[PDB]
Enzyme design. Structure first.
Site, mmCIF file in Angstrom:
data_model
loop_
_atom_site.group_PDB
_atom_site.id
_atom_site.type_symbol
_atom_site.label_atom_id
_atom_site.label_comp_id
_atom_site.label_asym_id
_atom_site.label_seq_id
_atom_site.Cartn_x
_atom_site.Cartn_y
_atom_site.Cartn_z
ATOM 1 N N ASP A 93 0.846 -1.188 0.000
ATOM 2 C CA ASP A 93 0.000 0.000 0.000
ATOM 3 C C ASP A 93 0.873 1.226 0.000
ATOM 4 O OD1 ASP A 93 -2.267 1.537 -0.118
ATOM 5 O OD2 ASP A 93 -2.774 1.281 2.019
ATOM 6 N N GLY A 189 -2.656 7.578 3.828
ATOM 7 C CA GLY A 189 -1.669 8.148 2.913
ATOM 8 C C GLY A 189 -0.713 9.084 3.618
#
Ligand SMILES: NCc1ccc(Cl)cc1CNC(=O)N[C@@H](Cc1ccccc1)c1nc(-c2ccc3c(N)n[nH]c3c2)c(Cl)[nH]1
Length: 238
Positions: A93, A189
């Site tokens: 990820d 993120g």
């Protein structure tokens, strides 16, 4: 961020807010400046994003209210998603945003150091998760960048907490056994920044967790040290 406090302007100068303009302009994910044309973020942020043309990167922001039509931003030239990435829960990820123009460094925006290969054996005791995400499960994106100090958790301990998942060494977890402090919706993120020898390092990328700040549910982060070669491969290409 659950159980956090307002950040001071310039406290996390590598933190960015990644906005989408499709259909309306709004915050999408957090991110980190790692180079003068590079943002490190989570690959899951780009689910359904068909073009980098709809993306705007804002650096040097404390408050989301600072963003208006006349606020300067960085356009995204390219979205680079790790090619082994399938889903946040499975790992890989990680994504890079190659910016259309160069970030001018200053006291409001500067890069965070990536962890060193030798730093795979170092124990971080001063880690902070930052973002404009929810303060509770049902909330809205926060105006002011929030921060929370979170202890790192071993892979073994994180694996006991996520029965049914495979917690890899390419993942790093952080949380209090009793919960209360964590990343939440809108923080993904963003960075998990750890201070060691007076230097901040990008130890993690806010990835996934079961709910927000729940007891015995650590936040799961991309373990940045395990991707330094991948980051260098994409940023130092000849
Ligand atoms: N389970 C929470 C948790 C706990 C510990 C850790 Cl380490 C990580 C996580 C994960 N936390 C996330 O951020 N998850 C992302 C996932 C995701 C990213 C992008 C697109 C779709 C999904 C997420 N972002 C939003 C979001 C984004 C933007 C806005 C907005 N403008 N209004 N409301 C919003 C809400 C939602 Cl909902 N979910």
């Amino acid at each position: 961020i659950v159980g956090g406090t307002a950040s001071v302007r310039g406290e996390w100068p590598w933190q960015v807010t990644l906005h989408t303009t499709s259909p309306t302009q709004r915050h999408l994910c957090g991110g980190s400046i790692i180079g003068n044309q590079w943002i490190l973020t989570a690959a899951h942020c780009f689910y359904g994003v068909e073009s980098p043309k709809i993306l705007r990167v804002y650096s040097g922001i404390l408050n989301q209210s600072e963003i208006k039509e006349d606020t300067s931003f960085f356009g995204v030239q390219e979205i680079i998603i790790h090619d082994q990435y399938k889903m946040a829960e499975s790992g890989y990820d990680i994504a890079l945003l190659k910016l259309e123009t160069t970030v001018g460094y200053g006291d409001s925006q500067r890069p965070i150091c990536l962890p060193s290969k030798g730093d795979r054996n170092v124990i971080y005791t001063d880690c902070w998760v930052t973002g404009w995400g929810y303060r509770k499960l049902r909330d809205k994106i926060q105006n002011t960048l929030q921060k929370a100090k979170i202890p790192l958790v071993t892979n073994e301990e994180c694996q006991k907490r996520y029965r049914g998942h495979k917690i890899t060494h390419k993942m790093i977890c952080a949380g209090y056994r009793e919960g209360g402090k964590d990343a939440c919706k809108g923080d993904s993120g963003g960075p998990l920044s750890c201070k060691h020898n007076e230097v901040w390092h990008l130890v993690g990328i806010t990835s996934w967790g079961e709910g927000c700040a729940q007891r015995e549910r650590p936040g799961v982060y991309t373990n940045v040290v395990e991707y330094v070669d991948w980051i260098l491969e994409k940023t130092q290409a000849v």
